[PDB]
Write a protein that binds this ligand. Structure first.
Ligand SMILES: Cc1cccc2c1CC[C@H](CN1CCC(c3c(Cl)cccc3Cl)CC1)C[C@@H]2O
Ligand SMILES: CCCCCCCC/C=C\CCCCCCCC(=O)O
Ligand SMILES: CCCCCCCC/C=C\CCCCCCCC(=O)O
Ligand SMILES: CCCCCCCC/C=C\CCCCCCCC(=O)O
Ligand SMILES: CCCCCCCC/C=C\CCCCCCCC(=O)O
Length: 282
């Protein structure tokens, strides 16, 4: 369980993340859409990111009420919606980041149309649907111990399907996506050795370098925010359950950290992207 002070602290953090995150993300989407022609492929992917982040941020009020009350009072439909938005958020985020890194390597190695990027976004959501619809069906509000909870139900026997879904989710929603990114940036590093002012026009080269560092930083913040949760949930699938109060606290705060990422992303755009930093003020 959790003390009420820790609960009010967590849910307060959720409120701040929700307001600032929705404001910033809606501002980013509004920028790329109705304030300019910033429709570069990178910004199309960024738009996808801000979209998923928007959706999960909407779930935070309900997760917070749930954390306060200790149970899920909204029924099945909102529970399925929340779970689906959750998995959709993870998979869409990692896949979009992967597409961003691949696009970066395409630009560095082969010196990309916004519409192609939009098609990539469609495919990203398609795979994210391959995972996201099943959990939306299996997700349910179950009175496990005479109390209502919101979870995905592992098929019987749970001691087998638990690990299968655990390691599969861990690999294909995190490790394999992260690994492709690592490959892309490693190939880019090998490419740029002994190359000064190469790849065409010096000024545009600078621009490319700025975008590359932006993508890398966003990826680094994402991974750094979600790695504890990914590891802990992997341990959860193996049956390793937290029974201490402080254990529950650490776990809750790690999830909170991931949602902090969900509000973190526009700030990174404001400090690391010139067009966003200028456009934010105007
Ligand atoms: C408070 C509350 C109320 C209703 C539902 C839930 C939660 C808690 C957070 C959890 C947060 N989830 C965050 C994402 C996490 C995860 C996912 Cl969806 C996919 C791959 C790896 C991980 Cl670590 C699985 C846990 C979701 C849950 O459905
Ligand atoms: C974001 C945080 C939201 C703040 C919490 C607001 C409401 C919690 C109290 C509502 C009590 C409803 C109980 C419903 C029920 O028991 O079925
Ligand atoms: C999801 C997977 C998409 C894989 C295709 C990679 C997108 C390349 C980006 C681009 O060339 O513009
Ligand atoms: C939810 C739906 C996600 C599917 C829409 C993805 C395409 C976004 C591209 C765009 O509108 O700029
Ligand atoms: C779009 C995702 C919606 C998926 C529909 C899930 C409902 C299935 C069910 O509740 O039995």
């Amino acid at each position: 369980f959790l003390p009420l002070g820790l609960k009010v602290t967590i849910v307060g953090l959720y409120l701040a993340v929700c307001v600032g995150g929705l404001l910033g993300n809606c501002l980013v989407m509004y920028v790329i859409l109705r304030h300019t022609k910033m429709k570069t492929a990178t910004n199309i992917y960024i738009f996808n990111l801000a979209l998923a982040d928007t959706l999960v941020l909407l779930t935070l009020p309900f997760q917070g009420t749930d954390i306060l009350l200790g149970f899920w009072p909204f029924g099945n439909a909102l529970c399925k919606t929340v779970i689906a938005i959750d998995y959709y958020n993870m998979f869409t985020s990692t896949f979009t980041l992967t597409a961003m890194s691949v696009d970066r390597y395409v630009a560095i190695c082969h010196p990309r149309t916004s519409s192609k990027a939009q098609a990539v976004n469609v495919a990203i959501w398609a795979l994210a649907s391959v995972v996201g619809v099943p959990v939306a069906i299996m997700g349910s509000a179950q009175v496990e111990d005479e109390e209502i909870e919101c979870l995905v139900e592992i098929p019987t026997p749970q001691d087998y399907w638990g690990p299968v879904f655990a390691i599969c989710i861990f690999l294909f929603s995190f490790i394999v996506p992260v690994l492709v990114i690592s490959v892309c940036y490693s190939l880019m590093i090998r490419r740029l050795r002994g190359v000064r002012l190469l790849s065409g026009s010096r000024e545009k080269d600078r621009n490319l370098r700025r975008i590359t560092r932006l993508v890398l930083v966003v990826v680094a913040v994402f991974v750094g925010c979600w790695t504890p949760v990914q590891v802990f949930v992997l341990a959860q699938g193996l049956g390793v359950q937290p029974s201490s109060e402080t254990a529950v606290a650490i776990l809750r705060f790690c999830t909170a950290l991931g949602y902090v990422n969900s509000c973190l992303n526009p700030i990174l755009y404001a400090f690391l992207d010139e067009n966003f930093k200028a456009c934010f003020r105007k």
